[PDB]
Each structure stands twice: as structure tokens, then as C-alpha cells.
Design an enzyme around this catalytic site. Sequence first.
Site, PDB file in Angstrom:
ATOM      1  N   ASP D  40       0.848  -1.193   0.000  1.00  0.00           N
ATOM      2  CA  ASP D  40       0.000   0.000   0.000  1.00  0.00           C
ATOM      3  C   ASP D  40       0.886   1.246   0.000  1.00  0.00           C
ATOM      4  OD1 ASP D  40       0.806   0.524   2.670  1.00  0.00           O
ATOM      5  OD2 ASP D  40      -0.941  -0.538   3.476  1.00  0.00           O
TER       6      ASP D  40
HETATM    7  P1  8Q1 Z   1      -2.430   4.510   0.291  1.00  0.00           P
HETATM    8  O1  8Q1 Z   1      -2.685   3.042   0.568  1.00  0.00           O
HETATM    9  O2  8Q1 Z   1      -2.926   4.967  -1.058  1.00  0.00           O
HETATM   10  O3  8Q1 Z   1      -3.289   5.314   1.383  1.00  0.00           O
HETATM   11  C1  8Q1 Z   1      -3.060   5.053   2.798  1.00  0.00           C
HETATM   12  C2  8Q1 Z   1      -4.082   5.862   3.597  1.00  0.00           C
HETATM   13  C3  8Q1 Z   1      -3.922   5.581   5.091  1.00  0.00           C
HETATM   14  C4  8Q1 Z   1      -3.857   7.351   3.354  1.00  0.00           C
HETATM   15  C5  8Q1 Z   1      -5.489   5.494   3.145  1.00  0.00           C
HETATM   16  O4  8Q1 Z   1      -5.666   4.087   3.347  1.00  0.00           O
HETATM   17  C6  8Q1 Z   1      -6.627   6.246   3.789  1.00  0.00           C
HETATM   18  O5  8Q1 Z   1      -7.013   7.285   3.280  1.00  0.00           O
HETATM   19  N1  8Q1 Z   1      -7.213   5.707   4.848  1.00  0.00           N
HETATM   20  C7  8Q1 Z   1      -8.377   6.321   5.473  1.00  0.00           C
HETATM   21  C8  8Q1 Z   1      -8.207   6.533   6.958  1.00  0.00           C
HETATM   22  C9  8Q1 Z   1      -6.994   7.367   7.306  1.00  0.00           C
HETATM   23  O6  8Q1 Z   1      -6.739   8.383   6.683  1.00  0.00           O
HETATM   24  N2  8Q1 Z   1      -6.210   6.907   8.288  1.00  0.00           N
HETATM   25  C10 8Q1 Z   1      -5.030   7.604   8.776  1.00  0.00           C
HETATM   26  C11 8Q1 Z   1      -5.345   8.787   9.643  1.00  0.00           C
HETATM   27  S1  8Q1 Z   1      -3.843   9.713  10.031  1.00  0.00           S
HETATM   28  C12 8Q1 Z   1      -3.287   8.880  11.459  1.00  0.00           C
HETATM   29  O7  8Q1 Z   1      -3.778   7.859  11.855  1.00  0.00           O
HETATM   30  C13 8Q1 Z   1      -2.138   9.560  12.133  1.00  0.00           C
HETATM   31  C14 8Q1 Z   1      -1.909   9.167  13.553  1.00  0.00           C
HETATM   32  C15 8Q1 Z   1      -0.815   9.982  14.218  1.00  0.00           C
HETATM   33  C16 8Q1 Z   1      -0.075   9.294  15.333  1.00  0.00           C
HETATM   34  C17 8Q1 Z   1       1.354   9.736  15.473  1.00  0.00           C
HETATM   35  C18 8Q1 Z   1       2.180   9.028  16.522  1.00  0.00           C
HETATM   36  C19 8Q1 Z   1       3.600   9.536  16.560  1.00  0.00           C
HETATM   37  C20 8Q1 Z   1       4.468   8.983  17.664  1.00  0.00           C
HETATM   38  C21 8Q1 Z   1       5.715   9.807  17.897  1.00  0.00           C
HETATM   39  C22 8Q1 Z   1       6.798   9.156  18.715  1.00  0.00           C
HETATM   40  C23 8Q1 Z   1       7.933  10.095  19.071  1.00  0.00           C
END
Ligand code: 8Q1
Lengths: 74, 74, 85, 85
Positions: D40
Site C-alpha cells: 500500500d
Molecule cells: P495509500 O494506501 O494509497 O493510502 C493510505 C491511507 C492511510 C492514506 C489510506 O488508506 C486512507 O485514506 N485511509 C483512510 C483513513 C486514514 O486516513 N487513516 C489515517 C489517519 S492519520 C493517522 O492515523 C495519524 C496518527 C498519528 C499518530 C502519530 C504518533 C507519533 C508517535 C511519535 C513518537 C515520538
Amino acid sequence: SRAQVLSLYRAMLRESKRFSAYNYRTYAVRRIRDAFRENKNVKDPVEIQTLVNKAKRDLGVIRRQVHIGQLYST
Amino acid sequence: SRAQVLSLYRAMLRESKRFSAYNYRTYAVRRIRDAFRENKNVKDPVEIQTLVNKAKRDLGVIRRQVHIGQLYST
Amino acid sequence: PPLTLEGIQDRVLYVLKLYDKIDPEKLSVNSHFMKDLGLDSLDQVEIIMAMEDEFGFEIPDIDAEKLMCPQEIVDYIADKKDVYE
Amino acid sequence: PPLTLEGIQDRVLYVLKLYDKIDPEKLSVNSHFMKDLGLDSLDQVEIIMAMEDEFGFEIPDIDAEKLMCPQEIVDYIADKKDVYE
Ligand SMILES: *P(=O)(O)OCC(C)(C)[C@@H](O)C(=O)NCCC(=O)NCCSC(=O)CCCCCCCCCCC
Ligand SMILES: *P(=O)(O)OCC(C)(C)[C@@H](O)C(=O)NCCC(=O)NCCSC(=O)CCCCCCCCCCC
Ligand SMILES: [Ca+2]
Ligand SMILES: [Ca+2]
């Protein structure tokens, strides 16, 4: 949106590489990867925005930690 | 040597561009160009080294002036 | 507007037509800056810096020192901006 | 040693053979990361970052997001490092 999530994913992994200790680079990378993947199949749009905002915030946390680490360096 | 002179010429012109006032950018550029050209046909090798050392030094002067200008900026 | 080879060549030559040391009637796309236009390597440094200003990006020293006619400049800009037509 | 197209392709594929999510027996120079290898776009971000490490330079986001098979990566590296044979 997809583009925003992937931009933040890359940016966070880039900042993770800037930690000087191997163990903490691997810790940050592992945390980033698991946190994004475990939400891959979230559908609720408002929940997506919430998670995007967390990424935006934690990108700031990572950048500040990198800077503080540089100050404690030799 | 030829390569060293041309590297310093370019570096000095690059730093000149970083002055904020148009008049001082043009002043620095004019001074650099005239100073290098008026020595183009010097042959005495030790005299060449002397002039190279001046360029090395004045590149430092230019960089420090750029930095001080940034401190007086808004 | 996205860059084209035609636009690149027109703008490269424009920059050179504003460089006052060049004889307008000898300038062509294959005019060698030294052998044909009577310039020297101090002039050449300035010419490439003028190309950086026109196209909005820096050219490393090792690359810049090789560009000694307009066509070579055009080919380089097109490469670095990924222009194919 | 200066880079060659053969060396670029060998090192690109090497990096992918160390990416543990790829089935070794489906990997080819034209394997699409998504349609053929079952990856992905989170994986793809990591793969291009690994290419940056291998070849020692950063790839802008707009460029990196387009590289979805090994041959596209090879072509891009060769372009950006000005490799012609
Ligand atoms: P690709 O397969 O074309 O696309 C992948 C994505 C995930 C973009 C796609 O599958 C999608 O659009 N999914 C829909 C749901 C979504 O967007 N999920 C992701 C949300 S963003 C997220 O979860 C960020 C969380 C942040 C946590 C950070 C932790 C950091 C730790 C730091 C330590 C020092
Ligand atoms: P190109 O035609 O292939 O080569 C040109 C050069 C000059 C490299 C070539 O003709 C040559 O080798 N000439 C031999 C003599 C020589 O090298 N001359 C130049 C010496 S370096 C020099 O003169 C630098 C002087 C530095 C003064 C700096 C003044 C800055 C003012 C700052 C204002 C803020
Ligand atoms: Ca190119
Ligand atoms: Ca190229």
C-alpha cells in the site's frame, strides 16, 4: 485527505531519522508506523480529521524533541 | 590556480546578492568585478597567491557584513 | 505556465541579448562564449548566474563551468526541470 | 566508482529484496508495488525513503509519490544522477 496523511507520514519518518541514538530512531519509527497503520481502515470522516490533527500535533512534538536532543549533544 | 579564482569569484558574487539594499548589492558586485578583472593578466605566481588570499579574506568580510545586515533588518 | 523547450531557448537567448558585452549579430544558439563571442571565464560565471535568476534555481559549480554555449544551457535547464517537448 | 544503469538497477532491486513485506518470487523490475506486490501507499513512502538512503539524496514528495515500480525508480535515479549508460 489521502495526500495530507501521506505527506505527514513521510515528514514524521524524516524527523525520526534525526535522532542521534539508534534505539530512539527505531522507537520513533515503530511508533509512527503502527499509529498510521492501525487507522488505515477507519472510514468515519470526522474521526479521520481528528487523527490528522494528532499527526500535525505530534509532528510538532517530534521536531521539538529533535531540537532539544541537539542541545544535549556534544 | 584558475579553478580557485573562479570558485571565489562566483562565491563572492553569490554573497553580494544577499544584501537587502539595491544600492549596496550593486556596489559589492561592481567592486568584485573590477577587482578580479583588473588582475586578469597578472603573471607573477606569488602575486597570484597574494590576490587569491585577499579574495579568501574578503569573502569572509562579505559574509560577516551580510550577517550584520540581517541583524539590523526588520 | 509549464516550461517548454521553445520557452527555455527564447528566455536563454533573451538573457544573453541583455548581456551588454555580446555582439548582437554574432549571437546564435550555438555561439561558443569564448571561441565565438569573445567572452572570458569571468563573463561566463556571470552569465550562468543570470540564468539562475531567470529560471529560479541554483546550478552547482561543477555543472555551471561546463555550459559554454546557449544550446548547452538550454539542454541543461530542460534536463533539470524535466522538460521533454 | 561512477554510477551506471546496471549498478542502479542492481541496487534498487537489492533494497527491495531487503523489504520484508515483498514476496521474493513476484519481485521483478516491472512489478507494480500495489497491483503486483500487494503493498500500500504507506509501504511505498518507506520504500522510496530506503532508496534515498541507498543513493544518498532526497527525492521531493511530488516526485516520490509517482514511483510505483522498480523500473520507474531506476529511470528516476539515472536521470537525477545524469547516468546515460
Ligand atoms: P495509500 O494506501 O494509497 O493510502 C493510505 C491511507 C492511510 C492514506 C489510506 O488508506 C486512507 O485514506 N485511509 C483512510 C483513513 C486514514 O486516513 N487513516 C489515517 C489517519 S492519520 C493517522 O492515523 C495519524 C496518527 C498519528 C499518530 C502519530 C504518533 C507519533 C508517535 C511519535 C513518537 C515520538
Ligand atoms: P577564464 O578566462 O578561463 O580565467 C580567468 C582567470 C582570471 C582565472 C585567468 O585569466 C587567470 O588565471 N589569470 C591569472 C591571474 C589571476 O589569477 N588573477 C586573479 C587573481 S584573484 C583576484 O584578483 C581577487 C581579488 C580580490 C578582491 C576582492 C574585492 C572585494 C570587494 C568587496 C566589497 C564588499
Ligand atoms: Ca531530468
Ligand atoms: Ca538528468
